[PDB]
Amino acid sequence: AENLWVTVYYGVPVWKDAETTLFCASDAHNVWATHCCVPTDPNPQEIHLENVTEEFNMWKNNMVEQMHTDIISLWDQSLKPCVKLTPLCVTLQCTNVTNNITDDGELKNCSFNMTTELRDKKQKVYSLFYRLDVVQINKEYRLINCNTSAITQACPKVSFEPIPIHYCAPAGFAILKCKDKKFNGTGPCTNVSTVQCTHGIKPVVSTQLLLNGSLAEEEVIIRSENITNNAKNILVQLNESVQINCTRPNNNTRKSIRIGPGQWFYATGDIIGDIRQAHCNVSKATWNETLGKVVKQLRKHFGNNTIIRFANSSGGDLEVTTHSFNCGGEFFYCNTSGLFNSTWISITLPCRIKQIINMWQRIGQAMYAPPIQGVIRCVSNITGLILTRDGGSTNSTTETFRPGGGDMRDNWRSELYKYKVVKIEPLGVAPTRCKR
Amino acid sequence: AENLWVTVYYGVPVWKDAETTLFCASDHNVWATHCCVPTDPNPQEIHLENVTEEFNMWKNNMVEQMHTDIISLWDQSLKPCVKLTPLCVTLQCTNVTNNITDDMRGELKNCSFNMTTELRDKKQKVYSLFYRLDVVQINKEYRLINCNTSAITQACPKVSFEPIPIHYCAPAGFAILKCKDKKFNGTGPCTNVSTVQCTHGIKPVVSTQLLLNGSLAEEEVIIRSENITNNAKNILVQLNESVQINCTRPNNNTRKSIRIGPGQWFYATGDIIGDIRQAHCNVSKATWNETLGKVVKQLRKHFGNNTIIRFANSSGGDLEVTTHSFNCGGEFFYCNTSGLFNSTWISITLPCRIKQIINMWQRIGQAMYAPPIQGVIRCVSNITGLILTRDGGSTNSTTETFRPGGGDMRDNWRSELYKYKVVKIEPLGVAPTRCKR
Amino acid sequence: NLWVTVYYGVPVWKDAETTLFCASDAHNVWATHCCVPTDPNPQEIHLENVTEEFNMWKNNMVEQMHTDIISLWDQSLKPCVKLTPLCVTLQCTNVTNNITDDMRGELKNCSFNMTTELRDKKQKVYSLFYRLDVVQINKEYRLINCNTSAITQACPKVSFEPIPIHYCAPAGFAILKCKDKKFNGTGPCTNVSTVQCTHGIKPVVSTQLLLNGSLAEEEVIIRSENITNNAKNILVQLNESVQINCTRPNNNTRKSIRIGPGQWFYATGDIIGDIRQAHCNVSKATWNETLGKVVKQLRKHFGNNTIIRFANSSGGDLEVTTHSFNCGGEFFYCNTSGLFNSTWISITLPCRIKQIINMWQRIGQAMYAPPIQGVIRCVSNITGLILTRDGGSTNSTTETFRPGGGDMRDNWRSELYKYKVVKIEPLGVAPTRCKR
Amino acid sequence: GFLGAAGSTMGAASMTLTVQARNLLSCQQHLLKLTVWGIKQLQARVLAVERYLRDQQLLGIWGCSGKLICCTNVPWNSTWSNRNLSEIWDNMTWLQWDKEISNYTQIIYGLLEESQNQQEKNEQDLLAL
Amino acid sequence: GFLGAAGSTMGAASMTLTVQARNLLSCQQHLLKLTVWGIKQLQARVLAVERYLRDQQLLGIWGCSGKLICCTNVPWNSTWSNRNLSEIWDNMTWLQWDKEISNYTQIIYGLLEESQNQQEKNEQDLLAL
Amino acid sequence: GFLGAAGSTMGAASMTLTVQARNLLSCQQHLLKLTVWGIKQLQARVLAVERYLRDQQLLGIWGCSGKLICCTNVPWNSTWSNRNLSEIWDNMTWLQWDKEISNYTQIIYGLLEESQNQQEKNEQDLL
Numbered sequence A: 001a002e003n004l005w006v007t008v009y010y011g012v013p014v015w016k017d018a019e020t021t022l023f024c025a026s027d028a029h030n031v032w033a034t035h036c037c038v039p040t041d042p043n044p045q046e047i048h049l050e051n052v053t054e055e056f057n058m059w060k061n062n063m064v065e066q067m068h069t070d071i072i073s074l075w076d077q078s079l080k081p082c083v084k085l086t087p088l089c090v091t092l093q094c095t096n097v098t099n100n101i102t103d104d105g106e107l108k109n110c111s112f113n114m115t116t117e118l119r120d121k122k123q124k125v126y127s128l129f130y131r132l133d134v135v136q137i138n139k140e141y142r143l144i145n146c147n148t149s150a151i152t153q154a155c156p157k158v159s160f161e162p163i164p165i166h167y168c169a170p171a172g173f174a175i176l177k178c179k180d181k182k183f184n185g186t187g188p189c190t191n192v193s194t195v196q197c198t199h200g201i202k203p204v205v206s207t208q209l210l211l212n213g214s215l216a217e218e219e220v221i222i223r224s225e226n227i228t229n230n231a232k233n234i235l236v237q238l239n240e241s242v243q244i245n246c247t248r249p250n251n252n253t254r255k256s257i258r259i260g261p262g263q264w265f266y267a268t269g270d271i272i273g274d275i276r277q278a279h280c281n282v283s284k285a286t287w288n289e290t291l292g293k294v295v296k297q298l299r300k301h302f303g304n305n306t307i308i309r310f311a312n313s314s315g316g317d318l319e320v321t322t323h324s325f326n327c328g329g330e331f332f333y334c335n336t337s338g339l340f341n342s343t344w345i346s347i348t349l350p351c352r353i354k355q356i357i358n359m360w361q362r363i364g365q366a367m368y369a370p371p372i373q374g375v376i377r378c379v380s381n382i383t384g385l386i387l388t389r390d391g392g393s394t395n396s397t398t399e400t401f402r403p404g405g406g407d408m409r410d411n412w413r414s415e416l417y418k419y420k421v422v423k424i425e426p427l428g429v430a431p432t433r434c435k436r
Numbered sequence B: 001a002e003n004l005w006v007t008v009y010y011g012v013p014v015w016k017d018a019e020t021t022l023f024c025a026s027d028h029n030v031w032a033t034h035c036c037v038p039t040d041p042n043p044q045e046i047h048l049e050n051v052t053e054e055f056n057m058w059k060n061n062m063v064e065q066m067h068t069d070i071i072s073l074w075d076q077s078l079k080p081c082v083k084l085t086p087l088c089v090t091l092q093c094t095n096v097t098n099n100i101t102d103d104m105r106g107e108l109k110n111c112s113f114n115m116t117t118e119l120r121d122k123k124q125k126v127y128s129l130f131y132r133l134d135v136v137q138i139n140k141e142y143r144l145i146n147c148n149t150s151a152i153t154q155a156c157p158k159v160s161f162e163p164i165p166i167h168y169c170a171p172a173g174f175a176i177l178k179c180k181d182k183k184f185n186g187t188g189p190c191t192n193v194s195t196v197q198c199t200h201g202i203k204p205v206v207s208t209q210l211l212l213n214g215s216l217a218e219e220e221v222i223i224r225s226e227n228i229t230n231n232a233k234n235i236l237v238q239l240n241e242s243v244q245i246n247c248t249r250p251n252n253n254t255r256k257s258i259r260i261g262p263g264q265w266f267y268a269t270g271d272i273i274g275d276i277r278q279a280h281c282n283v284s285k286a287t288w289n290e291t292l293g294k295v296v297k298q299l300r301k302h303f304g305n306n307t308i309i310r311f312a313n314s315s316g317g318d319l320e321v322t323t324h325s326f327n328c329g330g331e332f333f334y335c336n337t338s339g340l341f342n343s344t345w346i347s348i349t350l351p352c353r354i355k356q357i358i359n360m361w362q363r364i365g366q367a368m369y370a371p372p373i374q375g376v377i378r379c380v381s382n383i384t385g386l387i388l389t390r391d392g393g394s395t396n397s398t399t400e401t402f403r404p405g406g407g408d409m410r411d412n413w414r415s416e417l418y419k420y421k422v423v424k425i426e427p428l429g430v431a432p433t434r435c436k437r
Numbered sequence C: 001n002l003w004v005t006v007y008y009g010v011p012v013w014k015d016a017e018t019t020l021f022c023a024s025d026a027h028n029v030w031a032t033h034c035c036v037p038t039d040p041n042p043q044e045i046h047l048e049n050v051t052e053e054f055n056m057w058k059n060n061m062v063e064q065m066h067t068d069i070i071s072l073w074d075q076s077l078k079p080c081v082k083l084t085p086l087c088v089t090l091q092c093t094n095v096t097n098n099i100t101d102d103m104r105g106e107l108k109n110c111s112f113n114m115t116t117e118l119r120d121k122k123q124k125v126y127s128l129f130y131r132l133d134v135v136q137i138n139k140e141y142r143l144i145n146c147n148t149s150a151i152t153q154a155c156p157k158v159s160f161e162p163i164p165i166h167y168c169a170p171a172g173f174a175i176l177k178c179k180d181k182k183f184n185g186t187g188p189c190t191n192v193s194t195v196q197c198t199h200g201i202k203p204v205v206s207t208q209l210l211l212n213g214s215l216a217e218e219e220v221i222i223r224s225e226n227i228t229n230n231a232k233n234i235l236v237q238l239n240e241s242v243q244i245n246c247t248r249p250n251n252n253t254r255k256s257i258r259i260g261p262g263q264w265f266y267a268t269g270d271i272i273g274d275i276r277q278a279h280c281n282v283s284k285a286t287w288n289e290t291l292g293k294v295v296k297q298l299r300k301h302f303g304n305n306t307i308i309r310f311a312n313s314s315g316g317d318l319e320v321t322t323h324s325f326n327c328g329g330e331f332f333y334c335n336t337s338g339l340f341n342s343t344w345i346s347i348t349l350p351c352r353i354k355q356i357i358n359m360w361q362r363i364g365q366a367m368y369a370p371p372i373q374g375v376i377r378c379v380s381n382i383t384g385l386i387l388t389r390d391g392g393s394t395n396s397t398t399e400t401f402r403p404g405g406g407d408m409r410d411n412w413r414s415e416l417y418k419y420k421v422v423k424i425e426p427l428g429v430a431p432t433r434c435k436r
Numbered sequence D, E: 001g002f003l004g005a006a007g008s009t010m011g012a013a014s015m016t017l018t019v020q021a022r023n024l025l026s027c028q029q030h031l032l033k034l035t036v037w038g039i040k041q042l043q044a045r046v047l048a049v050e051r052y053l054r055d056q057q058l059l060g061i062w063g064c065s066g067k068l069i070c071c072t073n074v075p076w077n078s079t080w081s082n083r084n085l086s087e088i089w090d091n092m093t094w095l096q097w098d099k100e101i102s103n104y105t106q107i108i109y110g111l112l113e114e115s116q117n118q119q120e121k122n123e124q125d126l127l128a129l
Numbered sequence F: 001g002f003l004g005a006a007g008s009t010m011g012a013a014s015m016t017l018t019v020q021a022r023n024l025l026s027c028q029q030h031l032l033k034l035t036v037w038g039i040k041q042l043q044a045r046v047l048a049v050e051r052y053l054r055d056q057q058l059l060g061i062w063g064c065s066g067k068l069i070c071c072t073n074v075p076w077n078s079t080w081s082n083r084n085l086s087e088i089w090d091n092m093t094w095l096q097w098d099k100e101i102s103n104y105t106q107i108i109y110g111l112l113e114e115s116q117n118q119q120e121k122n123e124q125d126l127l
Ligand SMILES: *[C@@H]1O[C@H](CO)[C@@H](O[C@@H]2O[C@H](CO)[C@@H](O[C@@H]3O[C@H](CO)[C@@H](O)[C@H](O[C@H]4O[C@H](CO)[C@@H](O)[C@H](O)[C@@H]4O)[C@@H]3O)[C@H](O)[C@H]2NC(C)=O)[C@H](O)[C@H]1NC(C)=O
Pocket: B160, B162, B163, B205, B206, B207, B212, B213, B326, B327, B328, B329, B378, B379, B380, B381, B382
């Protein structure tokens, strides 16, 4: 003890939890491609750390906050330079489209008087509309957004097709990952390694059903910050994906009209075929087997032989009641109530379509989505679910779950779950036997 | 003889005068949100023992920085707010005659017009109330006073401009020297100084003629000037104790929210609830008489006792010059202070007017509309100083008249900045020694 | 018995592309952009025994000059009044009084219904126009750019007059100049020196003929990236300048029109006295001698006993068929055919006036020049020109040269041919006769 | 690997201190047109530089610059670790260490600055005869 | 105590160099769009770094890199001062003393640079035995 | 001058390395409004700083930090260049030399780092 001296070290491989921003890297006219200029590393170097046990908290994972903030920012950045649609907040004169009627009131034929290139004239023009974008004035209609906020047209040449994004640490920082295949929402796991960049995550946005994410390597896992708290949502990761085949089958064309000097508006013109309703096809057996696996896992927290029920969600805006898709730029709101219609102890889902889009439940800044020419097919892999647990249950033998939904950080919370960011702190001290 | 050698020292405690930036720190409000980084709860003021230095408040660049940064934030606050260009219309007007007192002689005007509706195809006929000061006659047709000169931006109703104490902090490598020497002249040497990393917070109070909510003035009335013999210069006067002033807007107003074409809303002044009265401020006459007596003694200190000291009770210029300015609750008051200056040395109620379309200091290229405030307004302020100009150049040395006004916010902000100076640290020094490599 | 020696602060460099900043000598747009004062005494450092390769055709400073100029031009216009309210049907007739025999209906008299400050009021005004900016509908005319883009008016208080601007290297970089004589613009030279900043170059904007530049070291210099490629521009730097006297003879009125709250438009009012066309005077003998000097050098490149024809350029947009320039703030499009009418082996060129222009030949942005009161004139120094070869066949007997150019980067390329910027690389290695 | 698990035998881990220090230092319109995005990235670069410089300045002022492991002239105080030497090199783990000595972090540093100051002060008079 | 003892004896003042020198290096996300405010602040950080590095480079070139107090083989000139050591670097303060030789800032630095340059050249020739 | 004698023989050019090294580090309110331009200029400053520090760190890694000219224990291979010192020091321009051996830059730097790492490890066994 009497012979101990201070010694100081530099470059010591230790760290503390910390926040910092991350860089966006990619591979391969596309917003994310333009943003995420930095190429990814073809050979990331994963370092296994053997004597490490480390506590991860995906629910307090800052990476989620950044991914969300950055996505909403890029969304606005891409819309900023596009043509404004204020001139369309006029009385709209509408009639029903009965022309090649399907019998599946959804589609209207409407007209309005639009200013021509000169300020002295306006031209009566017409286009087709979906009822979800148009509201009656006590044949007189107005666009819904004009009731509360401004709308901008999305640029027809700008793509939002998802590209897996890898987030990379700044020098002085490291990204740690939990490799434990059974890792639950929080805790001191023993399978820990260090990486420079995350696995790429596509910025896919959906509500209720999570598409094109990661699968559980071993078995379906049910995760929550507090599973016993009915105020929290439950995220479910599947070990196998389920293929879903979606369509917008009506072959149509688009018109382009002049609003002003270099100012163009694109809109749905006539359908050039007959008319049929949009939908998604889910394999029946696969879905029922998948759900049974979820049930087996729910029993772990809800009782070995309890009664588990799946039911349709409560009502509300489509953003929280239907399955949200963005396929080629068209947005769909598919009725999934038939996927949650059972008690445990080729499914066709009809789909609604709309062109006035609000983003991240932010009241204004509405966006208009011009149509796809021809028809569109969309195919996806479901990788997980958002479920909500009913509160108010006094009968302990029955527990009911419904499709849940909410803010999109949480889709990303799941994909970013296994990641944590720390700061490396190079200096430290110890007692020694040596002295100057 | 000793053949002393050159020695290099790093970290030598010396400085040179310097200009750099300033970090702003506080402890919805504009200043509060922008000055995110918190202040030091207890700045470790360093008294500098056996150090003297010079200060010159008239050459202090922090005045310009405070001024520039405040106006920048002012504009930033308005950048995201709805424009009122759709309101530049012909107004059909009459003057309100309902329950009005003897002083409000047509001051409140009732106007109507055809405004754009949610859909741009239709118009809505609406009416609202205006103050006479902001409405002018065309050739019973009226227009907004600023329709010819500039666009008017509505201020966002949710954003407060209540002054809060913002401290200015030095960048690393810089230091702020503070003058502690009591009753400092503003331009001479200061022999009692200290070093701080942050200044005292200063509330960005905006006023004209009188200086409100400032310091104690070193417990004496003190008169400072850039050039005491130049009658064209402003005189900055700090007071030994404040004069309390009680101000009101004695009218229960309605805020009438009107939807316009854009998803945005306009805030109209709605009908008045109850009777209509003139705005005013109450000043203790005895306190005011004592206050001036002290100012007068200081004026004699500078100019002699053998003269007569008068204050002007009138001035030229426009409303922003001739009246005193308050912004209580965001309400813009233009108070008549002529009653405070009958003077002539060997309670009092000052009527006030209200204006809603506000021009901006040192600019004309823009305009702002102050949304009406629902309910009534009451505030109390501390009069801590004055801006005076002598009406000099006269050969009649026997008397002199000191006129209130001539204010410029840079001079008003010089007050309370004058105690601080910015210097930079220059750590490298060289001196002779006994020893060489 | 040699070991590696590491040296720091060594005098070597590599070519590099960097960002340069500007300086000036001291409400001009160029002036407000260069807050950095110039060095009253630039230090040219001769480099003894340095041979260096320069390539004007690959000089990044051209792109740097271009980007800054185009960007600045727009930045200047950003805060100025928009002319959208004036895109109305015009009621037009010809100006017929006080017109000389040459201006055969080029000046138009139009009137229209436009805004005032109050929304409820309208005014009817008249103003004068040039034929080049007005198009007939199907008495009824419109401004030409109403369908294509927004037009703004330049601020009357803003001067775009060229100021010689000096570009300065950032620390770690240096500007290497070729001070050799009659340097080719490509390949090595042996007279090399360095500077901190370039000399000042005025940001002259012109098309077919090059004004107020280099005098080519008292010899005609023919420059081309590929002299045998007929499709390339041949840059000619003249031995001495040729003086040109330009005028706009009409005594003009500036009419101020209220648009809105702080919004003003400046219109052309009546012409006082006789109405005449714009023109430029060129000394005939000087010009004929100048072409002979050029021919001598062209023969060196194309054949000693061949026939060289100078001829009028081909047609196309006005902006590229004339010796376009900005004189007094006015835009002149002066006829070139009389300048190039000879075969080898005082003259007046008429000019057109236009106000709405596509600056930098970009489409989608338009600017309207303000009226200028009184009359205008300027005197310029012709220092060069741009020519192309017709070719079309191989014939050693003869070739034809016609005016080309129009791409502003080549005006800039010419003046910048003397220098390049390099990155200084202070770290290096060599062997020595020792070790630690 | 770049970092080890740092569980024990830090003396061997020390062989990598050089790489850890080395990696502290290292599109045009894609980012330049974007004001917020560009400022965030610059802020990150600047802060990384500041961190680098603070560590180097401290090693300099303490007299440890240029070394990866520095023996000092400041004795170990009992309060720092009441634990004897046997447990620190092998039994303790450096991250575990850091938690316990959080309170005595600044004091370690003040003493190091002072002892270096005294040494240089004395050097002046070794040269002065 | 950053600038404490600024009025102290020049000699005594050398004992505060560590403090004066070390201190030279020292909701926010919602202000990222507040472009001028934010750019001024970031520039200040950058500029502080630049000043720091310029002084450190000069020291490295002049020699005595890493030291707080050092000296070189350059005699003091009679044109700089003609004063006794007992009244210089003692019995006065640095603020006023520094003013006394402000002329010579550049010549001194040039002399420091040349001397170190010559010494290193000679060191390499001595190494090459 | 700053790059004066750049074309001279390296035996003499090296005498002014300190000058060159020093110089490597050398309406403002109008410019504050230029939102893209200001970033380009600030980046230039930041980038210059990083490059400077990067080179200084490398000297620390290789050793001889703080020195202008310094030799290491890494031998000259003679494969990088088999040219002799009379020619290198008296006839070759420093710039010509730099170009002649530019291939071997990375090889040398890796060697410099390893030699310095080894020396520190060896110093420790004394105590
Ligand atoms: C000199 O300093 C004095 C300090 O007293 C200052 O006068 C004060 O101004 C504030 C802001 O206008 C007043 O605050 C109000 O207090 C009442 C208390 O009953 C509240 O009800 C008020 O609430 C309304 O306004 C809020 C604005 O933020 C809203 O958020 C809220 O929903 C309500 O609409 C409000 O908080 C304070 O009462 C006065 N002081 C006195 C004695 O009246 C004075 O303005 C300063 N002078 C100058 C020139 O700056």
